[PDB]
Amino acid sequence: KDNITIHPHTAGTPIPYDLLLLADPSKELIDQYLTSGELYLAKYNNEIIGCYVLYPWDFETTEIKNIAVAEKFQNQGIGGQLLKDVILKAKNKFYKKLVIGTGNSSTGQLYLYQKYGFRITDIRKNFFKDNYPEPIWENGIECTDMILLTMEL
Amino acid sequence: KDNITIHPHTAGTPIPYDLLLLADPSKELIDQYLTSGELYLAKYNNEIIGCYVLYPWDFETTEIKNIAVAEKFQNQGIGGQLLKDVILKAKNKFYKKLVIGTGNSSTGQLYLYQKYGFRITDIRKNFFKDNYPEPIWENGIECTDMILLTMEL
Ligand SMILES: CC(=O)SCCNC(=O)CCNC(=O)[C@H](O)C(C)(C)COP(=O)(O)OP(=O)(O)OC[C@H]1O[C@@H](n2cnc3c(N)ncnc32)[C@H](O)[C@@H]1OP(=O)(O)O
Ligand SMILES: CC(=O)SCCNC(=O)CCNC(=O)[C@H](O)C(C)(C)COP(=O)(O)OP(=O)(O)OC[C@H]1O[C@@H](n2cnc3c(N)ncnc32)[C@H](O)[C@@H]1OP(=O)(O)O
């Protein structure tokens, strides 16, 4: 909606694993990019309803390692508001490219990221097969490969 | 449906440009891969309602350069029947890989081809921008790049 607020996560505050796990089934992988990344929390009427994690590769590129919206609040435009906020945060830290990777089966998400300016740029063959023990499925398609999209900032 | 027939196009028969143009807006590009490709026609109660073109790259790979279903008959499973038939024809000619390329904005099609066994393998940046004069748009996304998918036969 139009009355959502976004702030960085504060030390001592609970980490919204419920939300992060909607986007990444591995709590181990989440905690790893929380080490060097920056977590942001989207609040609406005092409740944390969404989040994203920015994860620098280097000076030029930073990656959205995780972006999630509470299941009760999806498909109301909150994700788009989050993506706009990520774009500003990455620009403010002088990154030149913003990257996000999603599953080959995530065809709905491939629309959304392109709507906000991401171009499809790379395929990571068997990324999910190699990095997650149990296979992952969407829409009856096995999610084996990562599709990487890139936005020039 | 279950009562569709598929046959190669016969010399002297009209070429269904109405159908081919649904899949490729350039009659010039269509006629070019009709030169070295093979056109197949799907008939239902005597009417041509779909078609595809197979276009060899070399001994190992052949490409679906064009696949189309009449607008009145779409989303009834005819395209899937066509894709199954292409797979058999390519195997029968001893190809090892079957390739199809669609637009970055064609997220519905990215589902369908993966459902029938195609993996996303390659991005052709600015393919449509370079090869078609007028820009092409889908779902409010500009169609600039070709997504190439590959099936091991
Ligand atoms: C790096 C990573 O984290 S990849 C994993 C991403 N996270 C997840 O998958 C976790 C689970 N899902 C979610 O948390 C969320 O659904 C998100 C983060 C993916 C998206 O957030 P949302 O608030 O649901 O998205 P939002 O409402 O802004 O837009 C979704 C869009 O999909 C569109 N859409 C609807 N049906 C379809 C469809 N069949 N195909 C494509 N797009 C569709 C909607 O219309 C909407 O677009 P629009 O606003 O232009 O009309
Ligand atoms: C190389 C080239 O030619 S690329 C260009 C391809 N051709 C074209 O775009 C021409 C215009 N379109 C067409 O001719 C046809 O629609 C084709 C050839 C793309 C597909 O043929 P169709 O008969 O419509 O497909 P079919 O009915 O078998 O299946 C379409 C699928 O999309 C699914 N679908 C529906 N909504 C969506 C959505 N939002 N996102 C993804 N998939 C969706 C349908 O459920 C169906 O899948 P299912 O059978 O597994 O449930």
Author numbering:
A (entry chain A), B (entry chain A): 2 to 154
Sentences from the paper on this structure:
General control non-repressible 5 (GCN5)-related N-acetyltransferases (GNATs) are a large superfamily of enzymes, playing prominent roles across a large number of biological processes including aminoglycoside antibiotic resistance, transcription regulation, protein acetylation and stress reaction.
The protein was structured as an α/β protein and comprised of six α-helices and nine β-strands with a topology of β1-α1-α2-β2-β3-β4-α3-α4-β5-α5-β6-α6-β7-β8-β9. The structure exhibits two β-sheets comprised of β-strands 1-4, and β-strands 5, 6, and 9, splayed to create a V-shape. Our structure contained a well-ordered acetyl-CoA molecule bound in the active site. The interface between acetyl-CoA buries 593 Å2 of surface area and mediated by 10 hydrogen bonds. Key residues involved in these hydrogen bond interactions include Ile68, Val70, Asn76, Gly78, Gly80, Gly81, Gln110, Tyr112, and Lys116, and specific interactions are summarized in Table 2. Based on the position of the acetyl-CoA in the structure and well characterized kinetic studies of GNAT enzymes, the most likely active residues are Ser107 and Try114. Approximately 62% of GNATs have been reported to contain a conserved Tyr as a general acid to initiate the catalysis, and the positioning of Tyr114 from our structural analysis is consistent with this. GNATs adopt a wide variety of assemblies, ranging from monomers, dimers, trimers, tetramers, hexamers, and dodecameric (double ring) structures. Analysis of the interfaces present in the crystal using PISA45 suggests the protein is most likely to be a dimer. In this assembly configuration, the two monomers bury a surface area of 1464 Å, and mediated by ten hydrogen bonds and eight salt bridges.
